[PDB]
Amino acid sequence: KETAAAKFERQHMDSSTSAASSSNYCNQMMKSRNLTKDRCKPVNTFVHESLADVQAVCSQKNVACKNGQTNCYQSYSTMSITDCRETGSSKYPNCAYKTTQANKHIIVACEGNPYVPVHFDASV
Template sequence: MALQKTLSLLLLLLLTLLGLGLVQPSYGQSMYLRFQRQHVDSTQRGGTSLYCNKMMQTRGMTRPRCKQFNTFIHADIGTINNICRTPNIRCKNGKMNCHEGVVRVTDCKLTASSPRNCRYQGRASSRRVVIACDGNPLVPVHFDG
């Protein structure tokens, strides 16, 4: 009986802290880590098909099926986090939590696929990107375009 009461109080405390924004749910953290895995590569210049073929496979975007299109941002995560500090703009889904900045990127477009074999064409450029940010502090959680 005392254990049930203690657990109930802990749950109430956690819900209160979540409501106040003092504790972030792991969902936001996992989305931030997923964003980094899928879109951040500060160590390479990219731009080639060889780069895309390697990175898409290494970063797990060829299983269970080939991802059609992906963009890698060639900037450190601090620079990308700073994009979240720019003024809000509307995302493709209508939410107002997107932000834009100009960075160097490699766009990887699927050109051929067969079981266990995804082939991509790479194209490097410096261009405007739009990312959705969430959390406190704001961090990138979705590449919007």
């Protein structure tokens, strides 16, 4: 099946853009990444950084996860991120999102060999 590490890249990585360009960003990216296929995923963050800069977070500030796990890491640097959150007009299969572009530090959980991000925890 897809790896936890490949699922994080499909859900979270957008190295192909620097920032969301239009209020449509989340609607197009949630659908094309397959995030709306069984239900509307309600919150999802996109990171507009190279894959190497985000895998590097796994060697940065170790912090507790929101759930208490201690395999979380916070980026030293802020990153370009897009927060996509479902709107009150959102109704399955026509999921709809509000797009918010920001520069925030990211908190990811890491696992494995090589030790890479497998979960997006929070932007701060």
